[PDB]
Amino acid sequence: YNVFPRTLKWSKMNLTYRIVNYTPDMTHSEVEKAFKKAFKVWSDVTPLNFTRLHDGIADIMISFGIKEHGDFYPFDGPSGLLAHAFPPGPNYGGDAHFDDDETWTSSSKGYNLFLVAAHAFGHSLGLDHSKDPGALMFPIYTYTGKSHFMLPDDDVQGIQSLYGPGDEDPNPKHPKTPDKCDPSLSLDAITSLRGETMIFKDRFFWRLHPQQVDAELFLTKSFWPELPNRIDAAYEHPSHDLIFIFRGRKFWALNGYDILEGYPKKISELGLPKEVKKISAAVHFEDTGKTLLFSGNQVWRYDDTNHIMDKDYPRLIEEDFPGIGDKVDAVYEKNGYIYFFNGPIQFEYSIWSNRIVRVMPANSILWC
C-alpha cells in the first residue's frame, strides 16, 4: 500500500456522502446500493461510518461526468480513465467523479460500478495507488470474478495504518498476494507461453522470461476474464501456439487471450473416467506428441496427435516416476528434464537416466 504525501487523512470518523447526480446506465436504487456497498468495504475494517445526505454539502461529493465535466481534469470517452478521486480535505477533497462514457453495471459486463467505487473511495479516504497487483488500490482495473468480494490484505493494512481496525471484521481472513520468496510456497500449475514460464498460484500467475530474474505478477483475470481464478493444471502445444488449462472437470484451449471455439470441454471427452474430479498436473512433449495427465496417485498418457488415450493407462506415479511421492501439484519439462512439484519441493527428473538428479525448493523456480 501507499498513503498520500503528508499522510492526508480525515480528522473525523463520521463521514457524509451525497450522490449529486446519477448515471442513466443503472437505476437510482441500484446505484445507491453499489455506493453503499462500496463504503462498507472500508467501514467493515475501520472505525469509519458513512452517512448519505440528500441535499447540501457532504465530505464525499459523488458525481457522474462526461469529458470536460467541471474540474479541469476531463474524461476520455469509453475505456481509459474510469473515474478519479481527491484525497481527504475540504471542497474537492474526498470527492469522486465517474466517467459516464463507461457503461456502468452491477454485473460482469461494462464497468462494475461497485468495484470502481470501492477503489475510488480508497483515495477519498487517503490511500494512494498500490504496487501489489492483487490489491484493490492497484492503478489498473480488473473485474475480480463472480464470487463475493473480499478486500485484499494490502488494502486492509493500508487503510488501518490511517484509522485502526473496526470492532468486528465480518470477514477477518483477507486474501494476501503470494510471496515468491517464502520457502513453504507450493504451486498450482506451470507452463510455457512464447518461451516464458507461466507459474499459477491461486488467482495469480507469475510470467518469467528466461532473460530475467524477477518475475512479473499478474491476476489471471487480466489475461483471461472468462477463466477461473484458481486452476488445477496447465500445459502447452508450442507449435500451434496453444495453452491448455484445467479446473475441475472443465478444460480450456487458449491461443493467447482467445478461448478456442468449443471450449470449455469436459475432461471426459479427453477419455478420463467419471471418478476423476480434477487433473492435478499436466505436461506435454513436443517431439512425441504425448501429454501426461496426473490425478491423485495415478498418470494418464493422452496422445494429442491421434486424439485417444494411450493403451495401458492409468498407471501409478509410484511405478513410472519412483521417488517423487504420491501426488503431483504441478509439472513442466525442459531439455529432457521433468520438474515435479510436490508441496514446497521440486524433483528434477532425468528422462535420460530415468532417475531424480536434483532436489530443490519449489520457489526456486522464481529465483528465490
Binding site: 504525501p5 475505456s79 474510469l82 489498473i140
Partner: peptide, 19 residues
Amino acid sequence: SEEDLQFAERYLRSYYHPT
C-alpha cells in the same frame, strides 16, 4: 495563504483500463 489547500488537487488519482 493557500499552499495548503491546493494539496488535495495535486494528488487527484485516476483509475485506468486499457482499450
